[PDB]
């Protein structure tokens, strides 16, 4: 029967894209675990008490990012070009996380913001031009905001560990982030929702810098 033929065909197609869904599920679990490892690793800087080998931690981190580059690059080979916007929602969270941790390492290294390109390169991702994985401007900005929160927390803890120079640099920085985000007319209304938190971050950091200033700490 013609109808039955149509539906056995569509059955083949569906099974196929479910194999794709399965593969992507697995790889997303791997990147999620590597993201958790890098997370617990960099979150040692908050316990400033002691040695805290921040440059060493940054090295280990770069390693885990290499692993993320190979796992991530194991996908670009399998699936068609356009498909890489269809299953986006599966790796949106994990991707924004990896962007975050990236910008975190690079800040702990240079006290600046990773250009989006530098991020794609660290993660092993094709630019908007080449076919494969891409870094949605949305995912980028999201990771940057996660970073802003991480840096306000690290500001407080920095003061607690006797570090009075770091809070200042973090104030300057987070302020830069705020002005930049102000330049933007926020498309998407979940991104704007995080932008509402950015203000709380700025205020918190500025308040730390204040609490130092008025007690005679530059």
């Amino acid at each position: 029967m013609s109808v039955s033929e149509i539906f056995v065909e569509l059955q083949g197609f569906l099974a196929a894209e479910q194999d794709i869904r399965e593969e992507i599920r697995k790889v997303v679990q791997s990147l999620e675990q590597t993201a958790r490892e890098i997370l617990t690793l960099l979150q040692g800087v908050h316990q400033g008490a002691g040695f805290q080998d921040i440059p060493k931690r940054c090295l280990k981190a770069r390693e885990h990012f290499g692993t993320v580059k190979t796992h991530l690059t194991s996908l670009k080979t399998k699936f068609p070009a356009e498909q890489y916007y269809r299953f986006h929602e599966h790796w949106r969270f994990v991707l924004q996380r990896l962007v975050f941790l990236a910008a975190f390492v690079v800040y702990l290294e240079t006290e600046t913001l990773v250009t989006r390109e530098a991020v794609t390169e660290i993660l092993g991702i094709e630019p908007d031009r080449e076919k494969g994985f891409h870094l949605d401007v949305e995912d980028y900005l999201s990771g940057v905001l996660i970073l802003a929160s991480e840096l306000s927390r690290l500001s407080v803890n920095s003061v607690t560990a006797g570090d009075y120079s770091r809070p200042l640099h973090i104030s300057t920085f987070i302020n830069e982030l705020d002005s930049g985000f102000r330049l933007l007319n926020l498309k998407n209304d979940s991104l704007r929702k995080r932008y509402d938190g950015l203000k709380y971050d700025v205020k918190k950091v500025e308040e730390v810098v204040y609490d130092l200033s008025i007690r005679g700490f530059n």
């Binding site: 999620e32 979150q43 407080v156 803890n157 005679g216």
Partner: protein
């Protein structure tokens, strides 16, 4: 009316009715475990460095005894049944008990009680036993966090300058643990992560304020 079907549904109405009754009983027992464990947590909040710490700890240890007794009854009521069918009837009470005992145990040892250590006390011989699930554990510990940040702000409020930092470190490790678990655990334990980050923020801000205030050498008198 005397058919095989009507009779089968008589045995069905009997079986179901029985399970529903046992369920309601476990709901009341769990409610008592919950209320009593909450009162125990308040009592432990009554503590200062003052003389009382000792007799408050023993008194609360009495209360917890009572709670375990309730749990004993629960164990009896269960054995002979598929626990993952009555579980959703005593799970809140169990989370509350874990919160309580882990709170007290932190006060006494400044360390997180383990799941096996919790279960040890939950063995009763005349022999019935009960096992807190890893999820009831994670949830009652998440709850423990809020009580810890409360204790921290309280100790700050009355001079204490060492307790704040201890609660700070401990809470920090616990948070790092929940982050190490991540999406691997049920949505239920993830809903906690938010409140957790809130409590961690409160504690860390407390310690920051102390460090920044106790480090100032004032060259202006009043």
């Amino acid at each position: 009316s005397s058919s095989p079907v009507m009779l089968a549904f008589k045995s069905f109405q009997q079986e179901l009715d029985a399970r529903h009754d046992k369920y309601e009983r476990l709901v009341k027992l769990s409610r008592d475990i919950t209320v009593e464990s909450k009162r125990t947590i308040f009592l432990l909040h009554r503590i200062t460095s003052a003389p009382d710490m000792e007799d408050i700890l023993t008194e609360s240890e009495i209360k917890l005894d009572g709670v375990r007794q309730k749990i004993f009854q629960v164990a009896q009521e269960l054995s002979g049944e598929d626990m993952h069918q009555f579980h959703r009837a005593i799970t809140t009470g169990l989370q509350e008990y874990v919160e309580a005992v882990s709170f007290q145990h932190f006060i006494k040892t400044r360390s997180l009680i383990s799941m096996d250590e919790i279960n040890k006390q939950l063995i009763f011989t005349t022999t019935w036993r009960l096992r807190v699930t890893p999820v009831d554990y994670l949830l009652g510990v998440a709850d423990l966090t809020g009580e810890l940040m409360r204790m921290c702000i309280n100790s700050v409020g009355n001079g204490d300058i060492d307790t704040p930092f201890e609660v700070s470190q401990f809470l920090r490790q616990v948070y790092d643990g929940f982050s190490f678990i991540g999406n691997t655990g049920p949505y239920e334990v993830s809903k906690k992560l938010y409140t957790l980050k809130q409590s961690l923020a409160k504690v860390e801000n407390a310690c920051y304020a102390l460090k920044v205030r106790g480090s100032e050498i004032p060259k202006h008198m009043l």
